[PDB]
């Protein structure tokens with residue numbers, strides 16, 4: 001089919017550009033972009049130059065913390081009007097290129113945790129309005145009806161909390177609820193999401209994680225909580241606790257990369 005041939009064409013392109021044997025997918029959300037700096041012998045490509053991909057923004061291959069990583073710095077957002085096929089196309093590419101696991105980070109609003117926290121994601125709730133696997137199943141990639149019981153790979157999660165303790169960074173853990181965006185939530189919406197068991201809320205991740213699961217990729221997800229969700233303070237700006245958290249997240253992801 002159409003999608004599959006794109007997947008293969010973009011995979012060869014990337015192979016030809018020298019994208020050899022990435023072990024890890026790395027999606028750097030809101031201000032972990034910088035960490036793509038520290039990537040060694042980096043192949044750096046603009047999104048606009050990647051066939052079948054286009055302008056969401058860079059894709060970056062090379063070595064980080066001793067591992068082969070395929071990093072997205074700047075990521076597709078559903079609220080920008082990108083379909084769900086295009087949002088998750090980099091995830092199809094990471095699998096088809098041999099990646100074993102995905103590390104997806106993001107910035108989230110805090111329901112059960114407060115600003116400055118880092119929250120390993122233990123599960124998610126998809127409230128985006130859509131599911132990225134709608135359409136014909138991609139048999140080459142996975143089953144029609146994939147099990148989400150273990151989406152945020154419990155082995156990866158244990159590794160993250162060990163690394164966090166051993167390096168003395170506080171690592172919390174909880175449930176992310178994905179919404180579409182791009183408006184922030186009303187306080188009433190935040191009360192319902194709390195009732196539905198969410199600990200944090202943002203505008204990404206869920207669809208990528210679904211496709212990651214379908215593709216058989218293990219997954220690690222971490223939210224930086226950048227602010228109390230609507231209702232828990234009185235306005236939402238200055239979500240720049242992102243900066244004060246920058247250095248802890250960087251060292252954490254690096255030291256996790258070593259151990260997965």
Ligand code: HPA
Pocket residue numbers: 107108109110184185201202203226227228229230236239
């Ligand atoms: O409060 C929020 N809501 C949804 N997404 C977000 N990303 C950062 N903060 C938020």
